[PDB]
Design a binder for this molecule. Structure first.
Ligand SMILES: CC(=O)NCC(=O)NCC#CBr
Length: 129
């Protein structure tokens, strides 16, 4: 895409050690699946195109971009070693939304709804087996 957007986060790297754990399986089959199909998922399903949105300061402010499309691909590609790396990606995504936007903005209300659902799902994350 545009040279004015940054390259998206890595989803593949043969040098990075990888594992499938029951927790990671849960994060794909339950957590991502639940959030991905939510009414409010669409702003989070791909990286922010700051050019298309006319937000030239977006990647001045957000230095750690993350989106659910990247998380989906990481999970599908078995990119992670553990669940905490994936949880951290979700946390980063929500925090970037809250940093860039204002309390009560539509996208923040959407993020808050998804984050509540995320927290409920993580409360049920199984012990690593
Ligand atoms: C995904 C994310 O961080 N959201 C940012 C975003 O698109 N804001 C639009 C405006 C205004 Br105040």
């Amino acid at each position: 895409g545009s040279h004015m957007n940054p390259p998206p986060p890595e989803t593949s790297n043969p040098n990075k050690p990888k594992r499938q754990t029951n927790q990671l399986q849960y994060l794909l089959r339950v957590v991502l699946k639940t959030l991905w199909k939510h009414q409010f998922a669409w702003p989070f399903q791909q990286p922010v195109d700051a050019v298309k949105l006319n937000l030239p300061d977006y990647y001045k402010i957000i230095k750690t971009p993350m989106d659910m499309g990247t998380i989906k691909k990481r999970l599908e590609n078995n990119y992670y070693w553990n669940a905490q790396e994936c949880i951290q990606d979700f946390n980063t995504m929500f925090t970037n939304c809250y940093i860039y936007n204002k309390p009560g903005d539509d996208i923040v209300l959407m993020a808050e709804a998804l984050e509540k659902l995320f927290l409920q799902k993580i409360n049920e994350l199984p012990t690593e087996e």
